[PDB]
């Protein structure tokens, strides 16, 4: 079984540049075509470009001189060199294993294995990393708290509660774009009221986009 | 340019009945070998897409029966004989024909009708923390409910608000096909401290009357 990862999406420039690595794990894909697939804001699925086993390429209309797609198979690696970004080309970036080179007339099973993706942000506005303030569970069954991760950029930010451990319940919402253009978000859980005073919840956030790491402890006031 | 046309763009389906999405290409997917290279991905929340049918009509590894594809040719149509909440995502059509270039479609959105459901309501004040950086938020969460419609009123020492609250809503969810939702309202330090009564007031279909939780600063 093969594993795709992406890396290297970050915010940039317009105008800027930047390299995308997909790396493959498992098997070879040196065989397989490899494909370049953006999305914008979670909905949309756009082509973009592509390499076959022999180093031949393929774009769309929309970034042909500006794209260049390589490979690396000691590496088992695709790599995607953009050039003159604009923000237009701000979305999710996957990586997809295509069928193998030549072989599509006679052996094609569909598009079966893509990377988790990996996202670009062309803007010229900062890195800011987030503030995380407490969401206190109300002194009044099932309770509700959270955290609120306010004024960050770019996206994303992920958050996690108590290292993982607790799932059920979670709510972390989309982020939402402030007037500012800085984005927030919150992140909430509903837990058995009578646990409130014997168990402890800490919010866990990344802003890997700025290095930002916050455990928050969220206790009834 | 070869293009690609999906409908409908979303549809809402009751577990249990069927779902039928239709995928048109501009020319022919058809080639010589009888084959027709148009596949079908879904996007769940929060997952990258997956491969549902290969070459029009061929259900890929692990995907149920209750998947199937059929068409020739420019029309094609994914049928899910019975919906299950577990669905519930984008479904995008794809052709193959130009391999190794690729063309999607623009992806249809499918939702899942329940039973109404009411929310349950929250209110959180802003934190010491917050308020010496000289903002105020005040969040109000609506936790898992259905319909997605829902009306969220902010007041003020009961004066009503405008301009300065924003909403998020969750994807539905894949297991009990219901949406939370988060209004936050945003004041001034100054502003905030000028007034006691903060309250929420939540107008939803699976509730008796309007909803309003409140707190004192």
């Known amino acids: 079984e093969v594993q795709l990862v992406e890396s290297g999406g970050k915010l940039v420039q317009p105008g800027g540049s930047l390299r995308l690595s997909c790396e493959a794990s498992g098997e070879s894909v040196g065989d397989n075509d490899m494909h370049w697939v953006r999305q914008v804001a979670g909905k949309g699925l756009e082509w973009v470009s592509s390499?076959?086993?022999?180093?031949?390429?393929y774009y769309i209309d929309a970034v042909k001189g500006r794209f260049t797609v390589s490979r690396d198979k000691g590496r088992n690696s695709v790599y995607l060199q953009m050039k003159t970004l604009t923000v237009g080309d701000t979305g999710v970036y996957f990586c997809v294993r295509g069928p193998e080179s030549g072989w599509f007339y006679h052996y094609y099973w569909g598009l079966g294995v893509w990377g988790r993706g990996t996202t670009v942000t062309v803007s010229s506005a900062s890195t800011k990393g987030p503030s995380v303030f407490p969401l206190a569970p109300s002194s009044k069954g099932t309770a509700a708290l959270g955290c609120l991760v306010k004024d960050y950029f770019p996206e994303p930010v992920t958050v996690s509660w108590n290292s993982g451990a607790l799932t059920s319940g979670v709510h972390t919402f989309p982020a939402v774009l402030q007037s500012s253009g800085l984005y927030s978000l919150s992140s909430v859980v509903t837990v058995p009221s009578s646990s409130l005073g014997t168990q402890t919840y800490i919010c866990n956030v990344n802003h890997k986009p700025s290095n930002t790491k916050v455990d928050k402890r969220v206790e009834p006031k | 340019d070869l293009l690609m046309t999906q409908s409908p763009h979303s549809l809402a389906v009751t577990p249990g009945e069927p779902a039928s999405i239709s995928c048109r290409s501009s020319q022919s997917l058809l080639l010589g070998n009888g084959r027709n290279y148009l596949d079908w991905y879904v996007q769940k929340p929060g997952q990258s897409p997956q491969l549902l049918i290969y070459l029009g009509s061929n259900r890929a590894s692990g995907v149920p029966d209750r998947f199937s594809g059929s068409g020739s040719g420019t029309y094609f149509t994914l049928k899910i004989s019975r919906v299950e909440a577990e669905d519930v995502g984008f479904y995008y059509c794809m052709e193959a024909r130009q391999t190794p270039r690729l063309t999607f479609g623009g992806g249809t959105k499918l939702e899942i009708r329940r039973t109404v459901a009411a929310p349950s309501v929250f209110i959180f004040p802003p934190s010491d923390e917050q308020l010496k950086s000289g903002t105020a938020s005040v969040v109000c969460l609506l936790n898992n409910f259905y319909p997605r419609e829902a009306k969220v009123q902010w007041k003020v020492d009961n004066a009503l608000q405008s301009g300065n609250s924003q909403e998020s809503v969750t994807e539905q969810d894949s297991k009990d096909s219901t949406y939370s939702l988060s209004s936050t309202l945003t004041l001034s330090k100054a502003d905030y401290e000028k007034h006691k009564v903060y309250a929420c007031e939540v107008t939803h279909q699976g509730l008796s009357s309007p909803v309003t939780k409140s707190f004192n600063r």
């Open positions: 390499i076959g086993s022999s180093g031949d390429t």
